[PDB]
Design a protein around this nucleic acid. Structure first.
Lengths: 112, 104
DNA sequence: CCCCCCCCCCCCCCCCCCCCCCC
């Protein structure tokens, strides 16, 4: 598991309540989507120049349930995970790719 | 950056020479594809886009199997393809408080 | 080490974009 580092650290708020589901053979998989905003004002004072980014975080086991029990819409949380892009096929049988921050082995989540 | 933190840190090797391009006013956009793997060997590919100065250096000194350290943000952009189907794509972008660095 | 995954950021002086499958 050497050959480099895959690390993403996030601090942000949930868009909606955690969407927990069960994976085959003992579920415990919680999908949360969080926002991080950023600001600036490049071409002349625009009184604002916000820009929200949405991240798709996925927790497993213990943490999946913790989020399930204590994370609600607004919760602010700290996340440390790895990026993983998964390929899946859609209705029309076309190839799709989804990138996520999965909180696994050396991961971690924590309410703020 | 009101609201939280959005940051990704990668250390891996380019799977292919830097594909450098020059967008409109201000040509400087390099795209690289970084590989990071793990034994226990499952690898993951990353799309990192460098801009400006970082862009030129990537073009200048980075080559295929090169190992780099990257500090950036996570961005996912949507674009409809020649089919009328909405697509999304997330990449690590090295902008503001980000950095790139040649290792070894 | 890269075999490729993916079209492709716009902070931090002093909301919530929402589009997103099931490691």
């Amino acid at each position: 598991a050497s050959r480099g580092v895959n690390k993403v650290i996030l601090v942000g708020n949930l868009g909606q309540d955690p969407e927990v589901r069960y994976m085959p053979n003992g579920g415990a998989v919680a999908n949360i989507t969080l926002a991080t905003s950023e600001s600036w004002r490049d071409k002349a004072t625009g009184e604002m120049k916000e820009q929200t980014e949405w991240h798709r975080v996925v927790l497993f086991g213990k943490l999946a349930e913790v989020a399930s029990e204590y994370l609600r819409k607004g919760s602010q949380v700290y996340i440390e995970g790895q990026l993983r892009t998964r390929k899946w096929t859609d209705q029309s049988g076309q190839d799709r790719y989804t990138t996520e921050v999965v909180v696994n082995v050396g991961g971690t989540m924590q309410m703020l």
